[PDB]
Write a protein that binds this ligand. Structure first.
Ligand SMILES: CC(C)(C)NC(=O)[C@@H]1CCCCN1C[C@@H](O)[C@@H]1Cc2ccc(cc2)OCCCC(=O)N[C@@H](CC(N)=O)C(=O)N1
Lengths: 99, 99
């Protein structure tokens, strides 16, 4: 689909068999999801954003369905203000910026 | 044009008569520019993200050229690690997400 930016590019995603809302974020290198229970092992990690660094749980090869499109990759779980889908997963679904 | 997301979507912009490299960010509601002595009246503001909040100066009606595309709107100047072009200006240049 073609998405305009007059409103936040929020879409429904399915992760861990659970539906959630997430922001298509071209300005994010990684995908960061709000604290939740994901199966499998995780390694501690730190990522930075506008107001500093935060500690997150890194889960690898996690299946994520974005607007019906399949992706399998790294998902960081931590105290983020909103769920964001970053470039690591956006590239998997062939997302591009056009103008 | 069409921009892929293999790398950070960095483009050249022109603000206050200066050329800068900025990030096209669909996840940013506002445009945040690195510290610079821009002329004009401003109002104190606090914006948050991953990381917490940072203090910025809000400047309205600032002419910004993005890849040859003229635009004008609110620009927040503060201690940001990178120049961020948010949705407030992306909509003006007709930018869209496609997948
Ligand atoms: C207006 C304002 C910029 C404050 N909004 C945001 O930061 C909102 C808040 C809610 C969640 C999404 N973010 C936008 C998101 O694109 C932000 C904006 C941004 C901040 C700092 C950056 C680069 C981009 O420097 C490199 C810092 C490394 C980086 O890419 N950080 C990403 C997250 C990540 N590690 O994948 C990020 O926070 N991206």
């Amino acid at each position: 689909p073609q998405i305009t930016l007059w409103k936040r590019p929020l879409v429904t995603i399915r992760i861990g068999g659970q539906l959630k809302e997430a922001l298509l974020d071209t300005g994010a290198d990684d995908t960061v999801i709000e604290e939740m229970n994901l199966p499998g092992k995780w390694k501690p990690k730190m990522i930075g954003g506008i107001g500093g660094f935060i500690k997150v749980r890194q889960y690898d090869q996690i299946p994520v369905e974005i607007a019906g499109h399949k992706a399998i990759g790294t998902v960081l779980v931590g105290p983020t203000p909103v769920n964001i889908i970053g470039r690591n997963l956006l590239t998997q679904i062939g997302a591009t910026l056009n103008f």
